[PDB]
């Protein structure tokens, strides 16, 4: 059930990021409209700029969180698929890799590491050889629907909104300003 | 037929290494027998020491070549076994790795390399788990005989006879000395 909770937390993160983007766009269009207005409202313009900055930071944080959650869902799905696949074909896979994998239970640390790295890049070469053909890859039947719903890759909006990087001091100041803004808006 | 060629090359290299070892042992025994004698034979002792050094260098070269050929034949066997195993189970393996390897036919270089790396350490984790359960690994039935004859690892004598690490200068000096020794033996 870990896959299901990963999936619906990813969906919640997506919904939160969409809400953040929507409210940021609403604030931006309101600020532009007040710029077009005749009224000066200098204090209103400054506070709107502050709101725009803090909500852009919130959108960036939400996009980063959603991207991380999506990557976690993909990683756990990969882990489970390798698990049940190789429970299926472990004997054959080890037979294909016996000269580097036999005696693993008693080999020393350096020998174990070198053997697993040799098996590793042998597997990498095999994957390259298969991908050279260009066969179409379909999803696992057991977990196809969840991974199709989350998509192969996050949207370009997610990666671009998360492109901006913030220093820890910027992170704490933006968190404090966002908390203050939320408290003020609630009251 | 490449596997058979590598196997017989490894066998020939092992035979040559054994021949060099027995020649060096005979030279050492004869040198000790002369040294234990009351005769001086200073020139004889010096030329025997030269022959001993030449034989030791030849033994090192033969052991290194034999180890390299054994590694090569093991690598070829692994490549062929993993190739036909993955030709058998490619659909299932790609389905297990579907959420991460799609689009390889047209993705950019950096994305392709990162996807290959992520699939690679996912496979590493799966193989590590299998080694954790501890089921005994057997050689592939198609080429079990060759892999058993060549052994799981090269002989420890070849392992500790190839730790001299001669410098290139010493390498061609010993090559010239060995050629001169062969010419003198012909005389």
Residue numbers in the entry:
A (entry chain h), B (entry chain g): 4 to 190
What does the article say, verbatim?
Phage satellite P4 polarity suppression protein, Psu, a building block of the viral capsid, inhibits hexameric transcription termination factor, ρ, by presently unknown mechanisms. The ρ hexamer adopts an NTPase-inactive, washer-like, open-ring conformation until NTPs (preferentially ATP) are engaged and RNA is bound at the SBS, leading to ring closure and RNA entrapment inside the ring. Our cryogenic electron microscopy structures of ρ-Psu complexes show that Psu dimers clamp two inactive, open ρ rings and promote their expansion to higher-oligomeric states. ATPase, nucleotide binding and nucleic acid binding studies revealed that Psu hinders ρ ring closure and traps nucleotides in their binding pockets on ρ.
A ρ variant harboring a P167L substitution has been observed to bind Psu more tightly than wt ρ38,43. However, in the ρ-ATP/ATPγS-Psu structures, P167 of ρ does not engage in direct contacts to Psu that could explain the higher complex stability. We, therefore, also determined cryoEM structures of ρP167L-ATPγS-Psu complexes. The results showed that ρP167L associates with Psu in a similar manner as wt ρ, with a preference for the complex II constellation. In this arrangement, a single additional ρP167L subunit can join one ring at the center of the complex (complex IIlocked). Incorporation of this additional ρP167L subunit leads to an interlocking of the two ρP167L rings, due to refolding and domain swapping of the central ρP167L subunits, most likely explaining the increased ρP167L-Psu affinity (Supplementary Discussion). Such refolding and domain-swapping in ρP167L only occurs in complex with Psu, as it is not observed in a cryoEM structure of isolated ρP167L. Parameters listed for ρP167L-ATPγS-Psu complex IIlocked refer to the ρ1-ρ6 subunits of ρ(A), which retain the standard conformation. Also in other complexes, lateral access may be restricted due to conformational restraints imposed by Psu binding. Such conformational restraints may be more severe for ρP167L, which exhibits higher Psu affinity. Furthermore, the space in the central channel of the ρP167L-ATPγS-Psu complex IIlocked is reduced due to ρP167L refolding.
